[PDB]
Amino acid sequence: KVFGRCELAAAMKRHGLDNYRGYSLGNWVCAAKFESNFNTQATNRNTDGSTDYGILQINSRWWCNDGRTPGSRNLCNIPCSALLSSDITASVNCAKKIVSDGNGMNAWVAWRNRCKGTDVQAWIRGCR
């Protein structure tokens, strides 16, 4: 599923990401925009042999199991494929643990490089 901007905003809010660990909702929408272009089915392989999955590009080394990643810890206790679903519940549940781990949203490279320090509330402009 490719979410619309406000659609995704409303869903992320529903699942409690708005100011989760102090991060305003526009951070999360911006993160999804540039990690996945709002597409829940996005996947991308990484040099260490892991893969990033879903709307927030959650990694198979630490967080989810994809069966082919050396060093896998599966700390969200979930198959990576669950992170590709139209329903973003599993991605949000796992992202909450990621953002809680020590480095906050810096775990998301696209957020760090394209969202962090910007006017992220622009990402929910227009939304009801």
JSON list of C-alpha atoms in Angstrom, two decimals:
[
{"chain": "A", "resi": 1, "resn": "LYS", "atom": "CA", "xyz": [0.00, 0.00, 0.00]},
{"chain": "A", "resi": 2, "resn": "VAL", "atom": "CA", "xyz": [1.15, 3.49, -0.90]},
{"chain": "A", "resi": 3, "resn": "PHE", "atom": "CA", "xyz": [-0.26, 5.82, 1.75]},
{"chain": "A", "resi": 4, "resn": "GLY", "atom": "CA", "xyz": [-1.28, 9.41, 1.16]},
{"chain": "A", "resi": 5, "resn": "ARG", "atom": "CA", "xyz": [0.49, 11.94, 3.41]},
{"chain": "A", "resi": 6, "resn": "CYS", "atom": "CA", "xyz": [-2.47, 12.82, 5.58]},
{"chain": "A", "resi": 7, "resn": "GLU", "atom": "CA", "xyz": [-3.72, 9.24, 5.54]},
{"chain": "A", "resi": 8, "resn": "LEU", "atom": "CA", "xyz": [-0.43, 8.08, 6.99]},
{"chain": "A", "resi": 9, "resn": "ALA", "atom": "CA", "xyz": [-0.36, 10.94, 9.49]},
{"chain": "A", "resi": 10, "resn": "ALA", "atom": "CA", "xyz": [-3.75, 9.95, 10.81]},
{"chain": "A", "resi": 11, "resn": "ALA", "atom": "CA", "xyz": [-2.77, 6.32, 11.15]},
{"chain": "A", "resi": 12, "resn": "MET", "atom": "CA", "xyz": [0.51, 7.09, 12.89]},
{"chain": "A", "resi": 13, "resn": "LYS", "atom": "CA", "xyz": [-1.36, 9.32, 15.36]},
{"chain": "A", "resi": 14, "resn": "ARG", "atom": "CA", "xyz": [-3.96, 6.65, 15.96]},
{"chain": "A", "resi": 15, "resn": "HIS", "atom": "CA", "xyz": [-1.21, 4.20, 16.89]},
{"chain": "A", "resi": 16, "resn": "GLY", "atom": "CA", "xyz": [0.41, 6.75, 19.23]},
{"chain": "A", "resi": 17, "resn": "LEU", "atom": "CA", "xyz": [3.48, 8.06, 17.37]},
{"chain": "A", "resi": 18, "resn": "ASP", "atom": "CA", "xyz": [2.58, 11.73, 17.83]},
{"chain": "A", "resi": 19, "resn": "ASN", "atom": "CA", "xyz": [5.22, 12.94, 20.31]},
{"chain": "A", "resi": 20, "resn": "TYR", "atom": "CA", "xyz": [6.32, 9.38, 21.06]},
{"chain": "A", "resi": 21, "resn": "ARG", "atom": "CA", "xyz": [9.70, 9.74, 22.89]},
{"chain": "A", "resi": 22, "resn": "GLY", "atom": "CA", "xyz": [9.23, 13.46, 22.32]},
{"chain": "A", "resi": 23, "resn": "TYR", "atom": "CA", "xyz": [9.15, 13.22, 18.52]},
{"chain": "A", "resi": 24, "resn": "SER", "atom": "CA", "xyz": [6.36, 15.26, 16.93]},
{"chain": "A", "resi": 25, "resn": "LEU", "atom": "CA", "xyz": [4.21, 13.58, 14.33]},
{"chain": "A", "resi": 26, "resn": "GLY", "atom": "CA", "xyz": [5.81, 15.40, 11.40]},
{"chain": "A", "resi": 27, "resn": "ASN", "atom": "CA", "xyz": [9.11, 13.69, 12.23]},
{"chain": "A", "resi": 28, "resn": "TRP", "atom": "CA", "xyz": [7.45, 10.32, 11.65]},
{"chain": "A", "resi": 29, "resn": "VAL", "atom": "CA", "xyz": [5.68, 11.33, 8.42]},
{"chain": "A", "resi": 30, "resn": "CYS", "atom": "CA", "xyz": [8.89, 12.89, 7.12]},
{"chain": "A", "resi": 31, "resn": "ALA", "atom": "CA", "xyz": [10.80, 9.74, 8.06]},
{"chain": "A", "resi": 32, "resn": "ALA", "atom": "CA", "xyz": [8.34, 7.57, 6.16]},
{"chain": "A", "resi": 33, "resn": "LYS", "atom": "CA", "xyz": [8.38, 9.90, 3.15]},
{"chain": "A", "resi": 34, "resn": "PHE", "atom": "CA", "xyz": [12.13, 9.60, 2.64]},
{"chain": "A", "resi": 35, "resn": "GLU", "atom": "CA", "xyz": [12.68, 6.06, 3.94]},
{"chain": "A", "resi": 36, "resn": "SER", "atom": "CA", "xyz": [9.94, 4.47, 1.90]},
{"chain": "A", "resi": 37, "resn": "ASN", "atom": "CA", "xyz": [8.10, 7.16, -0.15]},
{"chain": "A", "resi": 38, "resn": "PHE", "atom": "CA", "xyz": [5.05, 6.10, 1.85]},
{"chain": "A", "resi": 39, "resn": "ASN", "atom": "CA", "xyz": [5.12, 2.58, 0.35]},
{"chain": "A", "resi": 40, "resn": "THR", "atom": "CA", "xyz": [4.64, -0.25, 2.87]},
{"chain": "A", "resi": 41, "resn": "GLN", "atom": "CA", "xyz": [6.12, -2.79, 0.45]},
{"chain": "A", "resi": 42, "resn": "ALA", "atom": "CA", "xyz": [9.50, -1.10, 0.03]},
{"chain": "A", "resi": 43, "resn": "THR", "atom": "CA", "xyz": [12.56, -3.23, 0.62]},
{"chain": "A", "resi": 44, "resn": "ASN", "atom": "CA", "xyz": [16.26, -2.47, 0.21]},
{"chain": "A", "resi": 45, "resn": "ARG", "atom": "CA", "xyz": [19.33, -4.68, 0.70]},
{"chain": "A", "resi": 46, "resn": "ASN", "atom": "CA", "xyz": [22.27, -3.50, 2.80]},
{"chain": "A", "resi": 47, "resn": "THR", "atom": "CA", "xyz": [25.97, -4.28, 2.49]},
{"chain": "A", "resi": 48, "resn": "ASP", "atom": "CA", "xyz": [26.17, -6.32, 5.70]},
{"chain": "A", "resi": 49, "resn": "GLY", "atom": "CA", "xyz": [23.65, -8.77, 4.20]},
{"chain": "A", "resi": 50, "resn": "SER", "atom": "CA", "xyz": [20.63, -7.40, 6.06]},
{"chain": "A", "resi": 51, "resn": "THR", "atom": "CA", "xyz": [17.55, -5.88, 4.39]},
{"chain": "A", "resi": 52, "resn": "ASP", "atom": "CA", "xyz": [15.39, -2.88, 5.38]},
{"chain": "A", "resi": 53, "resn": "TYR", "atom": "CA", "xyz": [11.61, -3.48, 5.26]},
{"chain": "A", "resi": 54, "resn": "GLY", "atom": "CA", "xyz": [8.50, -1.36, 5.06]},
{"chain": "A", "resi": 55, "resn": "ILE", "atom": "CA", "xyz": [7.26, 2.16, 5.48]},
{"chain": "A", "resi": 56, "resn": "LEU", "atom": "CA", "xyz": [10.01, 2.85, 8.03]},
{"chain": "A", "resi": 57, "resn": "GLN", "atom": "CA", "xyz": [12.69, 0.56, 6.54]},
{"chain": "A", "resi": 58, "resn": "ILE", "atom": "CA", "xyz": [13.16, -1.61, 9.64]},
{"chain": "A", "resi": 59, "resn": "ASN", "atom": "CA", "xyz": [16.31, -3.73, 9.54]},
{"chain": "A", "resi": 60, "resn": "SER", "atom": "CA", "xyz": [16.67, -7.53, 9.50]},
{"chain": "A", "resi": 61, "resn": "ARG", "atom": "CA", "xyz": [19.92, -7.62, 11.53]},
{"chain": "A", "resi": 62, "resn": "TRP", "atom": "CA", "xyz": [18.41, -6.28, 14.75]},
{"chain": "A", "resi": 63, "resn": "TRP", "atom": "CA", "xyz": [14.65, -6.03, 14.57]},
{"chain": "A", "resi": 64, "resn": "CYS", "atom": "CA", "xyz": [12.84, -8.54, 12.36]},
{"chain": "A", "resi": 65, "resn": "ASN", "atom": "CA", "xyz": [13.56, -12.01, 11.00]},
{"chain": "A", "resi": 66, "resn": "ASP", "atom": "CA", "xyz": [13.98, -12.54, 7.26]},
{"chain": "A", "resi": 67, "resn": "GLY", "atom": "CA", "xyz": [15.77, -15.88, 7.42]},
{"chain": "A", "resi": 68, "resn": "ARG", "atom": "CA", "xyz": [18.85, -14.86, 5.40]},
{"chain": "A", "resi": 69, "resn": "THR", "atom": "CA", "xyz": [20.55, -12.24, 7.59]},
{"chain": "A", "resi": 70, "resn": "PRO", "atom": "CA", "xyz": [23.69, -13.13, 9.53]},
{"chain": "A", "resi": 71, "resn": "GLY", "atom": "CA", "xyz": [23.67, -11.97, 13.16]},
{"chain": "A", "resi": 72, "resn": "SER", "atom": "CA", "xyz": [19.90, -11.68, 13.35]},
{"chain": "A", "resi": 73, "resn": "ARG", "atom": "CA", "xyz": [18.47, -10.78, 16.80]},
{"chain": "A", "resi": 74, "resn": "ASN", "atom": "CA", "xyz": [14.78, -10.29, 15.85]},
{"chain": "A", "resi": 75, "resn": "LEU", "atom": "CA", "xyz": [14.17, -7.96, 18.77]},
{"chain": "A", "resi": 76, "resn": "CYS", "atom": "CA", "xyz": [10.67, -7.06, 17.60]},
{"chain": "A", "resi": 77, "resn": "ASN", "atom": "CA", "xyz": [9.88, -10.78, 17.41]},
{"chain": "A", "resi": 78, "resn": "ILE", "atom": "CA", "xyz": [8.30, -10.52, 13.95]},
{"chain": "A", "resi": 79, "resn": "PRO", "atom": "CA", "xyz": [8.86, -11.80, 10.44]},
{"chain": "A", "resi": 80, "resn": "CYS", "atom": "CA", "xyz": [10.10, -8.97, 8.26]},
{"chain": "A", "resi": 81, "resn": "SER", "atom": "CA", "xyz": [7.23, -9.69, 5.82]},
{"chain": "A", "resi": 82, "resn": "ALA", "atom": "CA", "xyz": [4.77, -8.51, 8.43]},
{"chain": "A", "resi": 83, "resn": "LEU", "atom": "CA", "xyz": [6.41, -5.12, 8.09]},
{"chain": "A", "resi": 84, "resn": "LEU", "atom": "CA", "xyz": [5.20, -4.88, 4.49]},
{"chain": "A", "resi": 85, "resn": "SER", "atom": "CA", "xyz": [1.48, -5.12, 5.16]},
{"chain": "A", "resi": 86, "resn": "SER", "atom": "CA", "xyz": [-1.16, -2.59, 4.35]},
{"chain": "A", "resi": 87, "resn": "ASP", "atom": "CA", "xyz": [-1.83, -2.40, 8.10]},
{"chain": "A", "resi": 88, "resn": "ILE", "atom": "CA", "xyz": [1.03, -0.47, 9.71]},
{"chain": "A", "resi": 89, "resn": "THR", "atom": "CA", "xyz": [0.51, -1.76, 13.26]},
{"chain": "A", "resi": 90, "resn": "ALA", "atom": "CA", "xyz": [3.51, -4.07, 13.27]},
{"chain": "A", "resi": 91, "resn": "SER", "atom": "CA", "xyz": [5.83, -1.43, 11.78]},
{"chain": "A", "resi": 92, "resn": "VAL", "atom": "CA", "xyz": [4.66, 1.10, 14.36]},
{"chain": "A", "resi": 93, "resn": "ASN", "atom": "CA", "xyz": [5.02, -1.32, 17.28]},
{"chain": "A", "resi": 94, "resn": "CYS", "atom": "CA", "xyz": [8.58, -2.13, 16.17]},
{"chain": "A", "resi": 95, "resn": "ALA", "atom": "CA", "xyz": [9.48, 1.50, 15.42]},
{"chain": "A", "resi": 96, "resn": "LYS", "atom": "CA", "xyz": [8.48, 2.35, 18.98]},
{"chain": "A", "resi": 97, "resn": "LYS", "atom": "CA", "xyz": [11.06, -0.08, 20.31]},
{"chain": "A", "resi": 98, "resn": "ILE", "atom": "CA", "xyz": [13.70, 1.16, 17.87]},
{"chain": "A", "resi": 99, "resn": "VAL", "atom": "CA", "xyz": [13.27, 4.80, 18.81]},
{"chain": "A", "resi": 100, "resn": "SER", "atom": "CA", "xyz": [13.52, 3.74, 22.46]},
{"chain": "A", "resi": 101, "resn": "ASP", "atom": "CA", "xyz": [16.90, 1.93, 22.07]},
{"chain": "A", "resi": 102, "resn": "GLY", "atom": "CA", "xyz": [19.43, 4.71, 22.74]},
{"chain": "A", "resi": 103, "resn": "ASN", "atom": "CA", "xyz": [19.90, 6.74, 19.53]},
{"chain": "A", "resi": 104, "resn": "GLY", "atom": "CA", "xyz": [16.26, 7.94, 19.13]},
{"chain": "A", "resi": 105, "resn": "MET", "atom": "CA", "xyz": [15.24, 8.66, 15.54]},
{"chain": "A", "resi": 106, "resn": "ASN", "atom": "CA", "xyz": [18.88, 8.77, 14.42]},
{"chain": "A", "resi": 107, "resn": "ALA", "atom": "CA", "xyz": [18.38, 5.03, 13.72]},
{"chain": "A", "resi": 108, "resn": "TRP", "atom": "CA", "xyz": [16.61, 6.27, 10.56]},
{"chain": "A", "resi": 109, "resn": "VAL", "atom": "CA", "xyz": [19.27, 7.53, 8.17]},
{"chain": "A", "resi": 110, "resn": "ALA", "atom": "CA", "xyz": [16.78, 9.29, 5.94]},
{"chain": "A", "resi": 111, "resn": "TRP", "atom": "CA", "xyz": [15.28, 11.06, 8.91]},
{"chain": "A", "resi": 112, "resn": "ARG", "atom": "CA", "xyz": [18.76, 12.07, 10.14]},
{"chain": "A", "resi": 113, "resn": "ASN", "atom": "CA", "xyz": [19.78, 13.44, 6.74]},
{"chain": "A", "resi": 114, "resn": "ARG", "atom": "CA", "xyz": [16.52, 14.88, 5.41]},
{"chain": "A", "resi": 115, "resn": "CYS", "atom": "CA", "xyz": [14.19, 15.54, 8.37]},
{"chain": "A", "resi": 116, "resn": "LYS", "atom": "CA", "xyz": [16.20, 16.19, 11.52]},
{"chain": "A", "resi": 117, "resn": "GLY", "atom": "CA", "xyz": [16.33, 19.90, 12.29]},
{"chain": "A", "resi": 118, "resn": "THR", "atom": "CA", "xyz": [13.89, 20.86, 9.52]},
{"chain": "A", "resi": 119, "resn": "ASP", "atom": "CA", "xyz": [10.35, 22.23, 9.79]},
{"chain": "A", "resi": 120, "resn": "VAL", "atom": "CA", "xyz": [8.87, 18.75, 10.07]},
{"chain": "A", "resi": 121, "resn": "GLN", "atom": "CA", "xyz": [5.38, 19.94, 10.97]},
{"chain": "A", "resi": 122, "resn": "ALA", "atom": "CA", "xyz": [5.09, 21.02, 7.36]},
{"chain": "A", "resi": 123, "resn": "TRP", "atom": "CA", "xyz": [4.53, 17.30, 6.70]},
{"chain": "A", "resi": 124, "resn": "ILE", "atom": "CA", "xyz": [1.13, 17.43, 8.38]},
{"chain": "A", "resi": 125, "resn": "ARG", "atom": "CA", "xyz": [0.02, 20.73, 6.91]},
{"chain": "A", "resi": 126, "resn": "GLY", "atom": "CA", "xyz": [-3.44, 20.52, 5.41]},
{"chain": "A", "resi": 127, "resn": "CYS", "atom": "CA", "xyz": [-4.36, 17.40, 7.37]},
{"chain": "A", "resi": 128, "resn": "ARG", "atom": "CA", "xyz": [-7.45, 17.13, 9.55]}
]
